[PDB]
Design a protein around this ligand. Sequence first.
Ligand SMILES: C/C=C/Cn1c(Cc2cc(OC)c(OC)c(OC)c2)nc2c(N)ncnc21
Length: 210
Amino acid sequence: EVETFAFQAEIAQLMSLIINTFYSNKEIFLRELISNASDALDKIRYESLTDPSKLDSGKELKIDIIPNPQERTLTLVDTGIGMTKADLINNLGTIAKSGTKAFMEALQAGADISMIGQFGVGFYSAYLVAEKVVVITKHNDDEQYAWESSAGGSFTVRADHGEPIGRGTKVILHLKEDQTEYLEERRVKEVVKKHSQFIGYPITLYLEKE
Ligand SMILES: C/C=C/Cn1c(Cc2cc(OC)c(OC)c(OC)c2)nc2c(N)ncnc21
């Protein structure tokens, strides 16, 4: 059963700005999504020190980046803490409102879009290159969910009965037609080396088969 929700007006405004503003330095999306994965990995690692059972859902802490030219998708998979249903519908957005406001104000005062991560809303930089984002996520003590948005003011959340991911998050970027450069491991490697070379988890960059 698919439930459809409206973004808060401010977040919809932010998404529209990211989609409609002329800004050529789009590659920064990858640094932001990798940093989100790293943060999530940091969180489950820290929690596991006082409750080792939190790793019963998977011991390995890693990030995989998988380009699929045929599906026109770039997928970032982490085995971090994951997100709950409450995160997806309510709590991440509640937190994001103030960061969104501060970022929008910063842009008006001369900041550029590449500073988005400092405001906690770097996730939304995905829409620099993606027409649709699907997030499959699994947190301990909650079910696996699929979140989806093609912007336009709404997102959906549904229980996901696809392949279990155990714990963590799969961010599936359905790329815009003119952003297919990010479907080549060569380009992805260049971006990772430039912006994400010191991330403290193994990042495996898959090669496209075709
Ligand atoms: C500061 C927000 C952290 C939530 N988060 C995001 C970014 C993110 C995902 C989101 O939903 C999937 C968000 O709400 C739509 C959101 O709003 C700022 C941010 N990636 C991940 C991830 N890989 N693993 C665990 N949590 C994550």
